[model samples]
Target: NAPFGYKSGSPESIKNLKDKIQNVVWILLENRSFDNILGGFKRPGFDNPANNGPFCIPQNVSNPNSPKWCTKAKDFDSVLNDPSHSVTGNNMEFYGTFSPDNAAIASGKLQPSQQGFVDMQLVSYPKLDPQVAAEQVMGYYTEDEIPTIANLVDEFTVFNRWFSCVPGPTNPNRLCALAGTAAGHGTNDNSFDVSGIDIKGIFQVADEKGVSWKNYDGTNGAFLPDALFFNYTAKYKKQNVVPLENFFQDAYLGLLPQLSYINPSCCGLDTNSMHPTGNVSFGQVFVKQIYEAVRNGPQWDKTLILLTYDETGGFYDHVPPPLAVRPDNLTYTEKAPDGSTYTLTYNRLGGRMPTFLISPYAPKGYVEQEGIDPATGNSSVYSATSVLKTLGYLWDLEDLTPRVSHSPAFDHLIGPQLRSDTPTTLTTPHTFP
Candidate 1:
């Protein structure tokens, strides 16, 4: 914990103040890390002299792709192999010690030397020449490469310490974001019936409280609601889930729900999900559209928007994830592609991701440092569940689980309930490689 403990105030005292927040929208982009986007910023202790970023990325590293390690992170490759982001790969990236976390290895320990990413790539793709796989983990883009995100961070509050729920792949990490737990799944491509998970999602809570919520799937073509991962919203799919066009219409008519979760492009066609091999420029355009809709809409005065990624997608990140609490006391065995099985534990936070809090209340030109847990003297970090934690506290909903209960809230980062100047709108269209 820092000299000041968690920057917290009595929610009972802020009950009237919290009521000012009439709408909360979450725009979840796909895979990206903090350094991958904002690392090039000339901020103190980040990209400046503190050397916490790739100010001078490793060069001349031996690689089969090339003699140099630099990669064309901005270029889109339609058929690029999915980066290694499985449970074992995540363990290696976070701990920088070992992969698979077996009994004989660095089992259950997070040594966090920021050294295992290249090694993990080698382990995940044994057939590929080590250097070729390493490029996938080491690649990053600069401000020139991702100008839209660069512009957003410069104008809003950037939560540098935000993390994902687990050191695993997309589905489980996203499940933790929504349900405060993965309900015992780990890999990305696995599909199962989530009807038995006991926890009520934010949607269910909103329903009980008489607050409106909607899942806006903004994919240009085929779609699947991310909300489907939770059983609580399964039945309401037809009623609460809508196409991207509806989101624009709602914003224009000031009919936005009390809470909205905006899903990026799905089902591949013209994707803006920002998954590797997907076009980054499309993602920027999508973000610009969302921002314009909210800024030009009637709810601008009381609306707060959070834009973040699902996971790091095996990308390079400077900060290591801290140990986290298990949502529930459940264990399951996950079989890897090589026919290897792992007794998976749903504990541990994932690598860092870019998180932005965009609102009139958000203090301008701010970079939120991680708070500390006064009781433990450890950095009180944030995870995907912090979304649920903040919403629960603001809306008077109960904590979905111990994991969500312990997560830090973002309310402290904001200022007084109002602002003067209208948001600056973007004019120039961004260019991409």
Candidate 2:
């Protein structure tokens, strides 16, 4: 019923007559929530109008005067400041509790109110008018503003419920995306380099299994995207890590590897990550370039591009985060700037991210409806680990953690028929000042 080397519905078989996908490219962008980007996206297959909004974030209980009611002058691609997506900040935003009782939360005693965006933004930007501050996080971008992502949404499949592995900061969530676990980190410890440390992440797992992969830095060689991984840099950095140019070269040359990662430049204002206050024009262009490189390449028919934000980046979303499976026995204890100590076991999912799966097999412009399991007639949960699980099923890599094992894969969405209607390039809307 299924091709060899491929799991039944978990189509991990990279090379089979049934499926044409031979290369996988994962581009993890920076902080942005599903609502912040694709909330108001309305089209043929996606008819969830209420999830989008004529709605506004409810008034904060803590700050009664905190911004309420949604009204926008005009949607823009850039923002004035970055919203707080930190442990305490999101706790306040999600649950309205600065000192979130992890035990109570894990036990389902307290549920997210989803009313603290105004309050959190007010705290993060006390200097700005409370409503203006709220607007930063409450704002949503339509296809008229962010064309690249929007076009991709119209062309590929976007996941409505893809959540970050942790309800915390960037680096740890990123680690989970790569390693199937956060290693008990709940915050961004960017300075801590994993140079000599040995962790068999997805890349290393691919390595032992003979899967060819590479990590490309979109910022050229000025930054190393995989430097955070000890094995990537410590042992395999010299050959595996390279610049963005090599990706284009390999794509055109049909030498693209089975797995690849292209990281956007998130260092400063002149970057392309779409991080808060960063020039979004650059981000859109960067995304366009990567898509074109793959679309025009000899590997076009055999490639899949997965694009998602690393975290929600402290934005407003109506849907609360779902519960998740813990990856390991590791514990995370950290002191917050709000003077409260928070302990975590990494069992909570973070905010909703606008995740897209781009491949020839994807039905044009459809929101994946696999949220409902046809096999058992139940709801399914998909997180960042779902990708790892899917990759593991294909590459025969051991489960990176308990979460990876517990996660569901999306290879079923890659329908049996490979397509020929995919566009060769996209137009990115750029408005830089």
Candidate 3:
């Protein structure tokens, strides 16, 4: 029952409902590359540097680990060619953008693998927007391993170059997605330093605006919500986070959330996966699960899905990460027992990163925005902040980071059916700007 005399049943009427808000579900995956997954990029002026695993080159650099630094030119061309290599977690992989190895150079930065195992590359990025580069090939997947995901990308909305976190790696990048502010917390530790980085300042902003938020991750094989809470209960013990099964059912019934955050259990069942375990290959099963949930959920057309990854886990790629200042120009305010603020320089990894937007109202075909501002426009050079800006625009939340200040709001992702006066299933012509 909408206001006035508008009926939401008829096709014509359903399309006219304004003030529509999507129940957004964002899914984050772990270590993957565009080279192994997307059959390697075939774009003009872009060549594939695919390989199986790390193949280093001599660089005049020294550290406690090694004097002659190295580079990672991993390989995956064999897997791409032979179907036999496509089993699961055996042959190397890439899902969307170039591998981390390639991105290290494209944005003009020194490779950490080459920089003697250093975390970040010390380079200057005046206008290196990793999201922009991912946009160039959003439709492509690292490989066709997940046909459902590929189909979704082809038929749905996809943002090609979706860089994970600035200066790459997993933990800090994943934090950037949840809080929308990576300034004071981008470290190399994986699931190790979750105790110190208290993002209450950002959460306080979300609370003040009355915006509901939560996270879902796999626990003991089944999808569970609030994985962060359970994993870090010692720190976030008092916070509210629903488990996965309950959250999913509630969401389907429209009794849960209008906005959501989800991270899958890590791929590989090996004891030393660094991330969580189970059968969630990269993000394949996660993608299929999301599609099914939304298709069967009560909130259908009014829902949007954002899918992305954390970083390229030691893979070969071509697009280098742009050299930008780390989050919050201040030296690391948080410190480890060693008392070190200097973790690594701002380095951009190769971005063949994959991201997608799926909604009943999104425009068909690739949407491109020229002169797009990264801060606030229909669509522009996006950052992790762009997502925060999107939530702010859709949910009226406060801006959480300087990145959000410049990143464009994702108004274009919502189609006319969700924002206009007509109601129909046919989509209006829309392209990314």
What lDDT would each prediction earn against the true structure? 0.67, 0.73, 0.42
Consecutive 10-residue window with the lowest summed lDDT within model 2: 1-10
Tens digit of per-residue lDDT, candidate 3, span 287-392: 5656666656677657777766665443334444433324455333323222322233333322445556666666443432321454333333444555666676
Per-residue C-alpha lDDT of model 1 across residues 1-433, encoded as one tens digit per residue: 2112225434442453385578999977877777665556767535321244332233222333433333334323232545667776665555543334544333544356555565556666667664556455665555676677777776778887888887777777777788788878777543524443446677777889888889887754343567655566676644788888888888867899999888887425478787766766777888888888887888978888888888887776767676677789876566655465666666567888888888877766678778544234356888888788778767877778878877877766555546665455644345454
Q: Which candidate is the best by lDDT?
A: 2
Which segments of model 2 are wrong by more than 4 Å?
Answer: 1-18, 44-52, 64-67, 71-74, 190-197, 220-223, 370-378
Native RMSD of candidate 2 (Å): 3.4
Collision pairs in model 1: 1-377
- TM-score per prediction, in order, is 0.85, 0.90, 0.61
